[PDB]
DNA sequence: GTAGATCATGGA
């Protein structure tokens, strides 16, 4: 039986120039596309977000094959053959080998590859992005090139999606750690000397089942750019009340609960049979209490 | 239209009938001469909604003027949409819409 | 009998790349045809029957030999050193057009050492305006063009491959091999006759110079590469576009947008009223990574769909906004762009309106007034386009609104200051887009706007459409009546 | 005749890399059927690819997704060190913007029983029963799908733009994929037409079948 | 261990014209940009910030790097080769050698985000004019300025210095800030704290940026934030790990049921020095100094 | 004798 945890987490409010793109004279461009309704948002790759969660790992022991060397600023392998049996990150992320990219086969035998347990989607900024650039000149009264230069930084939330086939996991009791860095992420990369934003989570909708479909990717939304409120989307409550996600393979938590509880008819809707706490700790304590029951872990 | 915009364009009318009655005052104040101004009337007029600095100041003159003004046929017809509106709104949106209607004024041939 | 090698458009396994190389390799058949009529001339009686659609080829004997002597005939090396594609009419073409096109294929195609030998750096002084100019281009001796023929066919049997022909990225741009470790096995695979089409691609697609406007043109010469790859309709359309396209001048195809190149790829088409006419294009952006990359990379690819309405607009810019100016400094042949035709061709291939992104592109991203001085030269241009506007002529009101306020104005001051002392329209225009630019939110911008319209004393223009201008003015965001303030400015006739 | 099961597909993000699209990311504006059928058998769980040979796709676009581009340091086999810098390569990748669809699934030319429409049907009706691994993606194994469901002809009851199979049509979607090299990829031209039917016209239909 | 301290500084009340940006003609403009509730707030850059802390090492008397020369407003650095293990600044704000044996970059263990006007910004302006009749084109100028408190949030991660006991003089320069980049000449403003939120604590997890609001839009009332308050009701941040100082300290007593809720365990100090003093002891005993 | 690794190879 399979059982996968699926979750759309939002983060704080604060100015954040995080993934950028490639530079333009002075400017530092953010990297952006389109979203909702055609306008553009900023995004943050996927690709840094599982670093993130990479470097969180290998932060607290958690032996790991892909270690990152913080003074050479370089990635480096502990074991040529990845072992996802021994190594949290090879077991959660996965890994490619030179065979698997000449051969149709998954095998060569030692298996060639391993589709990671855990896929995040992209993060994208709940606000769509107006230009907004700062200034740069470096202190000296020697005004030579490389100085004045010009980084572009928005000031919303960013809100992603992610999941993970627990059942996929080599060691069931991964996940744990897994959801600690979740909550606990240290940085997504980026400006984090001149734009320090924490990517913890203020805001979160799990669904711990054993559907492969989870229908609430992206529930966060209030558009009307700048502005912070992060609403519940009206589409995502439409198909709670519709039968689809069972409420009681929901888990909510963080700053909307207060917003959802002020809501009126609440107490009568379909939403409030889901786990619902103000306090992100507890509803993670008791979520975690229920993925062990579920998967043995005990 | 929307409501507000009706209302809006209910002040820009009172305005420039306000505007109208005060000309018209000027006018038979200094019929003496080849002929009383009437780019140095608005000229003043800029100048002094220019001069409020803060809501009561803006208010009070606007309120001045208005009466001013005269019988303001448009403030007879919509006593309560425009009242409320004068009182609710950012006093600098009102002397945008104010100096609009200087600027959207017709002397009378 | 029975066709060696048969191409068609309708076959469901081409890209656009192949039906391009098919195109080029028409034009080229077409234009060896006309070199040599008689079949027997032709090197193994290579013989050819060309329709609207289809490509087959006859030949007797080896295939070797026969492929070898159309290939060695389609791509040619001049005494100059430059490459001479017989496709091409090239007496019609002049020296600097062809150095151009060399130039082109020289820093897309063949990107890599090893698929050209180069000769000296040969440099000719072409006398223009009275001054002659040095050029310097680096000669070949040999392209991989020119003997693909042997990796066509079999080492011993000297016959057409039965098998596929692994690729590389100077016959299919992009094909890179993302793993060079696994350089024998992944690699793009294709079968002969679409390998001799993509051998054939060069000839059809054009090559733009893209500038960027942030770096001034004097300080830093282009480097950045624009390939303008078409959607073929027909082989006889595409054909006459390109040869068409042999009449503009070199300097027409220095751009300053994406957009731009591919409108001025299909500039000279005609537009037949009772036709629906409608063309699509490719424009592939080739730029250095860092100063010191030793070849040009792909950067982006950018799809451009043109109407009838898209096509006419940007002849009517092209025919009434300034030409691009020819800047001549010693043994160099600086070529000044027009930004407002990049940013105009721009914003009719995104679909949005012309002036979309005039503000910060034309007066935040200025350094000298360089960018602000070209609107008083493009004056005529503006008053062309907003008369012909599409739509939306209630902004055109406001035009009229602004510039009969920007009149009063200045004739204010101007009546203040005597002969002598009057001010040049530069400085007043200059302080107020300082003024313009210091608005940072709505309030503040239409405050100022507001107070400069009833400064600008009576105006009859607002006073006949009251309420028209005053909700555009409430509703309206204020970029877009500061974007539209900026162009009634640069219309402004004293 | 079984009606053909239809799949409402939701996907907030979705790149679709052409065949040829090395050195650049170049996005495909719709699915190809060979990116389906991947994802398809991933949902039933079915590892083997020559298994469901012979399935017919038809793919409705509910709305035209927006294409942008991301910055990426995507990484690569060309050096034997791991931490050579040479590994590693910035390059941009395309991306489709709120991708939803609906898939029509016709299984009558399969020679496998049970089937892959019935297979998809069990997997729906019986989720708890359903054996396989790793997240349901389209595209990359970050893209992940938002919303998957059985529907209706007529779950919008809007307009569809189909992808009809013209031998004239821009798009070249490849129905079978070599991913070592191209020897093995087959091609189908299609062309996206705008239409107001609620089921798919003929030339609408594709079928997967082995390179063979 | 991994220890962070993550902190929100509010400076006090006055007229600031410290983020000039390119200017418009005639009038300088200060950075600015769009905030809480879609109104336009006077951001100061986190550089100034790095600056100033920078510029507080240096006269401090401790080894620094990158030596700034008041007198010839140059910069000039020490050693060629940036040495974090004997220089405070590149241990700890880090450096980047970008030029055609020791490393060429370092992460810094101080990370800073920009400091934000309190107050959203009304449109202020002054005028500035040299005095003489013989006036010129550089006789009259405008110069924007904002009445209104900043407030930034900064982060510091401990064990990512290669010596532990530069913490303290960071915080020292924290709560000590010199000059922060601006107009000193006409536009006073000292940036040193007057209301602190600090977390010491050894999760990842912060939740303590722009702890700040405002009573009243254009007012001098600078009140905690209502979400901070709720969270730390909820449980979420650890009393035990908060830190709060300065004159918010007399608003948090004066509020209702204080001496029941869970923000009144926390470590609260009317006085900043002794809130430094303590923080620094528990700072010292856990990183073992 | 052949595949993997290594090295050359490119300007105005």
Same mark, same amino acid.
Request: aromatic letters at 12%; a neutral charge.
């Given at each position: 039986?399979?059982?996968?945890?699926?979750?759309?987490?939002?983060?704080?409010?604060?100015?954040?120039?995080?993934?950028?793109?490639?530079?333009?004279?002075?400017?530092?461009?953010?990297?952006?596309?389109?979203?909702?309704?055609?306008?553009?948002?900023?995004?943050?790759?996927?690709?840094?977000?599982?670093?993130?969660?990479?470097?969180?790992?290998?932060?607290?022991?958690?032996?790991?094959?892909?270690?990152?060397?913080?003074?050479?600023?370089?990635?480096?392998?502990?074991?040529?053959?990845?072992?996802?049996?021994?190594?949290?990150?090879?077991?959660?992320?996965?890994?490619?080998?030179?065979?698997?990219?000449?051969?149709?086969?998954?095998?060569?035998?030692?298996?060639?590859?391993?589709?990671?347990?855990?896929?995040?989607?992209?993060?994208?900024?709940?606000?769509?992005?107006?230009?907004?650039?700062?200034?740069?000149?470096?202190?000296?009264?020697?005004?030579?090139?490389?100085?004045?230069?010009?980084?572009?930084?928005?000031?919303?939330?960013?809100?992603?999606?992610?999941?993970?086939?627990?059942?996929?996991?080599?060691?069931?009791?991964?996940?744990?750690?897994?959801?600690?860095?979740?909550?606990?992420?240290?940085?997504?990369?980026?400006?984090?000397?001149?734009?320090?934003?924490?990517?913890?989570?203020?805001?979160?909708?799990?669904?711990?089942?054993?559907?492969?479909?989870?229908?609430?990717?992206?529930?966060?939304?209030?558009?009307?750019?700048?502005?912070?409120?992060?609403?519940?989307?009206?589409?995502?409550?439409?198909?709670?009340?519709?039968?689809?996600?069972?409420?009681?393979?929901?888990?909510?938590?963080?700053?909307?609960?207060?917003?959802?509880?002020?809501?009126?008819?609440?107490?009568?809707?379909?939403?409030?049979?889901?786990?619902?706490?103000?306090?992100?700790?507890?509803?993670?304590?008791?979520?975690?209490?229920?993925?062990?029951?579920?998967?043995?872990?005990? | 239209?929307?409501?507000?915009?009706?209302?809006?364009?209910?002040?820009?009318?009172?305005?420039?009938?306000?505007?109208?009655?005060?000309?018209?005052?000027?006018?038979?104040?200094?019929?003496?001469?080849?002929?009383?101004?009437?780019?140095?009337?608005?000229?003043?007029?800029?100048?002094?909604?220019?001069?409020?600095?803060?809501?009561?100041?803006?208010?009070?003159?606007?309120?001045?003027?208005?009466?001013?003004?005269?019988?303001?046929?448009?403030?007879?017809?919509?006593?309560?949409?425009?009242?409320?509106?004068?009182?609710?709104?950012?006093?600098?949106?009102?002397?945008?819409?104010?100096?609009?209607?200087?600027?959207?004024?017709?002397?009378?041939? | 009998?029975?066709?060696?090698?048969?191409?068609?458009?309708?076959?469901?396994?081409?890209?656009?790349?192949?039906?391009?190389?098919?195109?080029?390799?028409?034009?080229?058949?077409?234009?060896?045809?006309?070199?040599?009529?008689?079949?027997?001339?032709?090197?193994?009686?290579?013989?050819?029957?060309?329709?609207?659609?289809?490509?087959?080829?006859?030949?007797?004997?080896?295939?070797?030999?026969?492929?070898?002597?159309?290939?060695?005939?389609?791509?040619?090396?001049?005494?100059?050193?430059?490459?001479?594609?017989?496709?091409?009419?090239?007496?019609?073409?002049?020296?600097?057009?062809?150095?151009?096109?060399?130039?082109?294929?020289?820093?897309?195609?063949?990107?890599?050492?090893?698929?050209?030998?180069?000769?000296?750096?040969?440099?000719?002084?072409?006398?223009?305006?009275?001054?002659?100019?040095?050029?310097?281009?680096?000669?070949?001796?040999?392209?991989?063009?020119?003997?693909?023929?042997?990796?066509?066919?079999?080492?011993?049997?000297?016959?057409?491959?039965?098998?596929?022909?692994?690729?590389?990225?100077?016959?299919?741009?992009?094909?890179?091999?993302?793993?060079?470790?696994?350089?024998?096995?992944?690699?793009?695979?294709?079968?002969?006759?679409?390998?001799?089409?993509?051998?054939?691609?060069?000839?059809?697609?054009?090559?733009?110079?893209?500038?960027?406007?942030?770096?001034?043109?004097?300080?830093?010469?282009?480097?950045?590469?624009?390939?303008?790859?078409?959607?073929?309709?027909?082989?006889?359309?595409?054909?006459?576009?390109?040869?068409?396209?042999?009449?503009?001048?070199?300097?027409?195809?220095?751009?300053?947008?994406?957009?731009?190149?591919?409108?001025?790829?299909?500039?000279?088409?005609?537009?037949?009223?009772?036709?629906?006419?409608?063309?699509?294009?490719?424009?592939?952006?080739?730029?250095?990574?860092?100063?010191?990359?030793?070849?040009?990379?792909?950067?982006?690819? $950018?799809?451009?769909?043109? /109407? %009838?309405?898209? +096509? @006419?607009?940007?002849?009517?810019? !092209?025919?009434?906004? =300034?030409? #691009?100016?020819?800047?001549?400094?010693?043994?160099?042949?600086?070529?000044?762009?027009?930004?407002?035709?990049?940013?105009?061709?721009?914003?009719?291939?995104?679909?949005?309106?012309?002036?979309?992104?005039?503000?910060?592109?034309?007066?935040?991203?200025?350094?000298?007034?360089?960018?602000?001085?070209?609107?008083?030269?493009?004056?005529?241009?503006?008053?062309?386009?907003? $008369?012909?506007?599409?739509? /939306? %002529?209630?902004? +055109? @009101?406001?035009?009229?609104?602004? !510039?009969?306020?920007? =009149?009063? #104005?200045?004739?204010?001051?101007?009546?203040?200051?005597?002969?002598?002392?009057?001010?040049?329209?530069?400085?007043?225009?200059?302080?107020?887009?300082?003024?313009?630019?210091?608005?940072?939110?709505?309030?503040?911008?239409?405050?100022?706007?507001?107070?400069?319209?009833?400064?600008?004393?009576?105006?009859?223009?607002?006073?006949?459409?009251?309420?028209?201008?005053?909700?555009?003015?409430?509703?309206?965001?204020?970029?877009?009546?500061?974007?539209?303030?900026?162009?009634?400015?640069?219309?402004?006739?004293? | 005749?079984?009606?053909?099961?239809?799949?409402?597909?939701?996907?907030?993000?979705?790149?679709?890399?052409?065949?040829?699209?090395?050195?650049?990311?170049?996005?495909?504006?719709?699915?190809?059927?060979?990116?389906?059928?991947?994802?398809?058998?991933?949902?039933?769980?079915?590892?083997?690819?020559?298994?469901?040979?012979?399935?017919?796709?038809?793919?409705?676009?509910?709305?035209?997704?927006?294409?942008?581009?991301?910055?990426?340091?995507?990484?690569?086999?060309?050096?034997?060190?791991?931490?050579?810098?040479?590994?590693?390569?910035?390059?941009?990748?395309?991306?489709?913007?709120?991708?939803?669809?609906?898939?029509?699934?016709?299984?009558?030319?399969?020679?496998?029983?049970?089937?892959?429409?019935?297979?998809?049907?069990?997997?729906?009706?019986?989720?708890?029963?359903?054996?396989?691994?790793?997240?349901?993606?389209?595209?990359?194994?970050?893209?992940?799908?938002?919303?998957?469901?059985?529907?209706?002809?007529?779950?919008?009851?809007?307009?569809?733009?189909?992808?009809?199979?013209?031998?004239?049509?821009?798009?070249?979607?490849?129905?079978?994929?070599?991913?070592?090299?191209?020897?093995?990829?087959?091609?189908?031209?299609?062309?996206?037409?705008?239409?107001?039917?609620?089921?798919?016209?003929?030339?609408?239909?594709?079928?997967?079948?082995?390179?063979?």
């Amino acid at each position: 039986p399979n059982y996968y945890l699926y979750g759309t987490v939002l983060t704080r409010y604060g100015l954040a120039s995080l993934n950028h793109d490639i530079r333009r004279g002075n400017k530092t461009i953010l990297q952006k596309g389109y979203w909702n309704n055609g306008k553009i948002h900023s995004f943050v790759g996927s690709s840094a977000i599982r670093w993130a969660l990479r470097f969180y790992l290998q932060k607290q022991g958690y032996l790991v094959n892909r270690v990152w060397d913080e003074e050479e600023h370089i990635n480096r392998l502990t074991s040529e053959d990845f072992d996802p049996e021994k190594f949290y990150d090879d077991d959660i992320f996965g890994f490619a080998l030179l065979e698997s990219a000449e051969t149709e086969e998954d095998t060569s035998s030692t298996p060639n590859q391993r589709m990671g347990a855990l896929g995040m989607n992209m993060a994208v900024s709940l606000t769509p992005y107006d230009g907004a650039v700062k200034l740069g000149a470096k202190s000296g009264r020697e005004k030579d090139s490389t100085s004045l230069h010009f980084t572009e930084y928005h000031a919303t939330r960013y809100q992603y999606y992610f999941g993970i086939d627990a059942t996929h996991l080599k060691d069931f009791s991964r996940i744990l750690p897994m959801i600690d860095g979740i909550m606990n992420l240290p940085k997504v990369g980026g400006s984090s000397n001149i734009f320090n934003y924490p990517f913890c989570p203020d805001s979160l909708v799990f669904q711990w089942t054993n559907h492969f479909a989870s229908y609430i990717s992206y529930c966060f939304e209030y558009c009307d750019p700048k502005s912070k409120e992060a609403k519940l989307s009206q589409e995502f409550i439409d198909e709670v009340e519709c039968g689809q996600i069972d409420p009681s393979k929901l888990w909510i938590g963080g700053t909307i609960v207060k917003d959802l509880q002020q809501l009126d008819n609440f107490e009568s809707s379909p939403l409030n049979k889901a786990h619902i706490y103000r306090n992100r700790n507890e509803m993670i304590e008791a979520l975690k209490t229920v993925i062990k029951r579920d998967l043995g872990l005990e | 239209n929307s409501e507000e915009d009706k209302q809006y364009l209910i002040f820009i009318k009172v305005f420039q009938q306000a505007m109208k009655g005060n000309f018209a005052k000027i006018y038979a104040k200094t019929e003496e001469g080849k002929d009383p101004p009437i780019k140095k009337k608005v000229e003043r007029l800029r100048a002094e909604l220019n001069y409020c600095y803060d809501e009561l100041s803006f208010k009070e003159y606007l309120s001045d003027f208005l009466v001013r003004g005269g019988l303001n046929k448009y403030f007879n017809e919509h006593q309560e949409e425009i009242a409320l509106l004068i009182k609710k709104s950012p006093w600098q949106e009102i002397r945008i819409w104010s100096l609009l209607a200087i600027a959207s004024y017709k002397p009378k041939d | 009998t029975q066709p060696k090698i048969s191409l068609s458009l309708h076959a469901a396994d081409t890209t656009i790349m192949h039906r391009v190389g098919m195109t080029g390799l028409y034009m080229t058949l077409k234009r060896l045809e006309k070199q040599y009529p008689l079949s027997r001339q032709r090197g193994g009686h290579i013989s050819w029957f060309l329709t609207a659609d289809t490509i087959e080829l006859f030949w007797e004997g080896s295939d070797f030999i026969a492929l070898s002597w159309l290939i060695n005939e389609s791509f040619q090396l001049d005494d100059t050193g430059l490459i001479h594609l017989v496709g091409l009419d090239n007496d019609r073409i002049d020296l600097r057009q062809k150095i151009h096109i060399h130039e082109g294929i020289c820093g897309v195609f063949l990107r890599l050492n090893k698929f050209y030998q180069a000769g000296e750096i040969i440099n000719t002084e072409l006398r223009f305006e009275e001054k002659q100019v040095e050029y310097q281009y680096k000669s070949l001796t040999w392209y991989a063009h020119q003997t693909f023929a042997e990796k066509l066919c079999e080492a011993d049997t000297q016959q057409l491959r039965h098998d596929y022909i692994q690729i590389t990225s100077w016959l299919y741009l992009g094909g890179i091999v993302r793993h060079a470790r696994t350089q024998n096995t992944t690699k793009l695979e294709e079968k002969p006759e679409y390998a001799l089409a993509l051998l054939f691609v060069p000839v059809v697609c054009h090559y733009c110079l893209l500038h960027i406007p942030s770096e001034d043109l004097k300080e830093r010469k282009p480097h950045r590469y624009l390939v303008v790859i078409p959607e073929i309709k027909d082989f006889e359309d595409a054909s006459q576009r390109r040869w068409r396209l042999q009449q503009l001048e070199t300097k027409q195809f220095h751009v300053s947008s994406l957009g731009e190149a591919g409108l001025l790829y299909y500039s000279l088409d005609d537009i037949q009223p009772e036709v629906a006419y409608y063309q699509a294009c490719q424009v592939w952006l080739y730029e250095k990574t860092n100063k010191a990359s030793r070849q040009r990379t792909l950067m982006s690819i $950018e799809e451009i769909k043109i /109407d %009838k309405n898209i +096509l @006419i607009t940007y002849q009517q810019v !092209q025919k009434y906004f =300034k030409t #691009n100016y020819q800047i001549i400094k010693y043994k160099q042949i600086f070529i000044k762009v027009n930004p407002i035709r990049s940013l105009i061709a721009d914003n009719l291939v995104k679909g949005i309106h012309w002036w979309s992104n005039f503000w910060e592109k034309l007066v935040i991203e200025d350094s000298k007034e360089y960018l602000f001085n070209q609107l008083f030269s493009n004056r005529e241009g503006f008053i062309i386009m907003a $008369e012909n506007s599409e739509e /939306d %002529k209630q902004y +055109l @009101i406001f035009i009229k609104v602004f !510039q009969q306020a920007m =009149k009063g #104005n200045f004739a204010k001051i101007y009546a203040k200051t005597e002969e002598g002392k009057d001010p040049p329209i530069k400085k007043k225009v200059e302080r107020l887009r300082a003024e313009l630019n210091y608005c940072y939110d709505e309030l503040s911008f239409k405050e100022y706007l507001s107070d400069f319209l009833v400064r600008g004393g009576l105006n009859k223009y607002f006073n006949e459409h009251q309420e028209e201008i005053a909700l555009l003015i409430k509703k309206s965001p204020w970029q877009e009546i500061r974007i539209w303030s900026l162009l009634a400015i640069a219309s402004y006739k004293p | 005749m079984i009606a053909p099961l239809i799949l409402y597909l939701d996907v907030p993000f979705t790149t679709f890399r052409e065949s040829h699209a090395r050195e650049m990311g170049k996005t495909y504006p719709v699915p190809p059927p060979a990116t389906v059928y991947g994802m398809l058998l991933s949902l039933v769980g079915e590892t083997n690819v020559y298994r469901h040979c012979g399935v017919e796709l038809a793919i409705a676009m509910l709305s035209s997704p927006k294409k942008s581009r991301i910055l990426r340091q995507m990484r690569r086999f060309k050096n034997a060190d791991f931490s050579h810098p040479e590994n590693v390569i910035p390059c941009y990748q395309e991306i489709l913007s709120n991708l939803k669809c609906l898939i029509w699934v016709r299984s009558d030319e399969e020679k496998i029983q049970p089937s892959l429409r019935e297979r998809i049907q069990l997997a729906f009706d019986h989720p708890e029963l359903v054996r396989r691994f790793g997240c349901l993606f389209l595209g990359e194994s970050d893209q992940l799908i938002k919303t998957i469901k059985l529907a209706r002809e007529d779950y919008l009851e809007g307009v569809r733009q189909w992808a009809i199979r013209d031998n004239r049509g821009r798009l070249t979607l490849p129905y079978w994929v070599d991913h070592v090299g191209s020897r093995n990829t087959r091609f189908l031209r299609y062309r996206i037409e705008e239409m107001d039917r609620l089921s798919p016209p003929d030339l609408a239909w594709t079928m997967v079948q082995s390179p063979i």
